[PDB]
Amino acid sequence: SGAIYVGNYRVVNRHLATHNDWANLVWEDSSRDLLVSSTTAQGCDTIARCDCQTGVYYCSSRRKHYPVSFSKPSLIFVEASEYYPARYQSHLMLAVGHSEPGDCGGILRCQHGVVGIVSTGGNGLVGFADVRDLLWLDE
Ligand SMILES: CSc1cncnc1CC(=O)N1CCC[C@H](C(N)=O)C1
Ligand SMILES: [Zn+2]
């Protein structure tokens, strides 16, 4: 679990969105595993606008933050699940690091702010759904 609170927006993994998220929907994209819903309170998270490939992510399964090198956002294949059929997930970035079912939603940060959230993982790898291209989160 985990979300990004920026302005009147809440960003979450689409496969973990609640009824309130769907009732206050702004935008959703299955191929990215992203859903953005509206909030009445102002969120205090800064989004990064960069091409950083180093950052720090929160791993709830270890209650620890880890530094990682990560790849450029791309279409990476993702196996079937109770949430999605087998497909290519776009805007996905991989890093060598621990993650397990329950870690989705952990924020990845660089020196410029929020880069994205944990969305995939397995075999010593962890995938992050990038949010840096979503320029409307600040306007
Ligand atoms: C940190 S998530 C994780 C980690 N280690 C093993 N498995 C997982 C689960 C995992 O990869 N997915 C299940 C939920 C939907 C994900 C998707 N973005 O399509 C795929
Ligand atoms: Zn950065």
Side-chain angles (χ1 to χ4, degrees), residues 99-121:
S99 61
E100 53 184 320
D103 277 325
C104 289
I107 290 173
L108 170 62
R109 284 189 63 89
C110 69
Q111 66 182 88
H112 312 97
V114 177
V115 172
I117 52 160
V118 177
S119 177
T120 77

Side-chain angles (χ1 to χ4, degrees), residues 10 13-14 37 47-48 54 68 80 83 85 89 93 96 98 101 103 105 113 120 131:
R10 164 168 142 104
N13 298 84
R14 193 199 185 266
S37 60
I47 306 292
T54 61
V68 283
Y83 308 102
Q89 173 163 314
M93 305 173 297
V96 171
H98 177 66
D103 277 325
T120 77
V131 308

Side-chain angles (χ1 to χ4, degrees), residues 3 8 14 17 28 30 40 45 49 58-59 62 65 71 78 83 87 98-99 108 116 119 126 130 132:
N8 295 335
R14 193 199 185 266
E28 53 83 20
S30 289
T40 80
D45 278 324
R49 298 307 180 194
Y58 179 68
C59 179
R62 290 282 184 276
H65 294 265
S71 68
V78 182
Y83 308 102
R87 89 239 196 257
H98 177 66
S99 61
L108 170 62
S119 177
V126 54
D130 181 69
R132 297 172 290 179

Side-chain angles (χ1 to χ4, degrees), residues 8-86:
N8 295 335
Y9 294 125
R10 164 168 142 104
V11 188
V12 278
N13 298 84
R14 193 199 185 266
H15 76 273
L16 295 187
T18 70
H19 284 275
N20 198 56
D21 288 319
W22 279 97
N24 289 302
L25 178 62
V26 174
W27 173 72
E28 53 83 20
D29 191 341
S30 289
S31 61
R32 297 179 64 164
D33 183 40
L34 292 179
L35 183 142
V36 167
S37 60
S38 53
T39 62
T40 80
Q42 207 91 69
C44 278
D45 278 324
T46 282
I47 306 292
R49 298 307 180 194
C50 67
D51 81 341
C52 271
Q53 282 188 240
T54 61
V56 170
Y57 81 103
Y58 179 68
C59 179
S60 64
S61 70
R62 290 282 184 276
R63 283 202 207 108
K64 264 178 157 89
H65 294 265
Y66 293 111
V68 283
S69 279
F70 57 90
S71 68
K72 310 210 92 73
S74 71
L75 269 172
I76 295 162
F77 177 82
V78 182
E79 273 216 89
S81 76
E82 31 189 340
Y83 308 102
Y84 295 115

